[PDB]
Amino acid sequence: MKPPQFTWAQWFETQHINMTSQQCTNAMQVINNYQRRCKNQNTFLLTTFANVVNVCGNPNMTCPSNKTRKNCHHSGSQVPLIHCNLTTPSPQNISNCRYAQTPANMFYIVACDNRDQRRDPPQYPVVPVHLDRII
C-alpha cells in the first residue's frame, strides 16, 4: 500500500528514513496524506539511506514478520529511532490525526531487494523495501 509514484525503496525512505519533522504528528501527515489513511503505528530510523543500504549487505536472515522470507537483514548496531503511535484518529479528515512519539535505541531488521530497474537510481543496485522489525 504505497502510492504509484514511488518504488518500494522510495516508499521505504518516505516511511522510515525521511522524518520531515521531529514531531510525529507532522511527520505522519506525509505518510497519511500519501496512503489516504492515518497509519496506526510507524517507526522512523534515525539513520541514513546509505547506512540502511549497507545493512542490506549484511547476511541474509529470515524475516521475523514472514517465516517464508529470506530477504531480511539485521543492522548489527543499535540506532536511535522514533516510534509514532496514533493518538487521535480521523477517518474523515487525515490531516487532523495526532500522534505520540516514543524515542528509543534498537536494532532493526530490513528486507532488501534488487532496485526497481525503471525508476530506482542505478547508484544503488540493492535497496531496503520494508522495515520488518525493531528489536
Ligand X SMILES: Nc1ncnc2c1ncn2[C@@H]1O[C@H](COP(=O)(O)O)[C@@H](OP(=O)(O)O)[C@H]1O
Catalytic residue numbers read: 16, 130
- Of 25-33, 44-52, 61-69, 84-92, the window that binds ligand X (rule: CB under 6 A) is 61-69
Cα–Cα dist 85/98, whole Å = 9
83 counts as binding ligand X under rule CB under 6 A: no
For residues 83 and 69, what is the distance between their CA atoms, to the nearest angstrom? 24
- Please select the residue that binds ligand X; options are 38, 55, 63, 86, rule is CB under 6 A: 63
d(CA 124, CA 109): 19
Which of residues 13 and 101 has its CB atom nearest to ligand X in the complex?
Answer: 13
**Can you tell me which of 14, 47, 49, 69 binds ligand X, judged by CB under 6 A?**
69
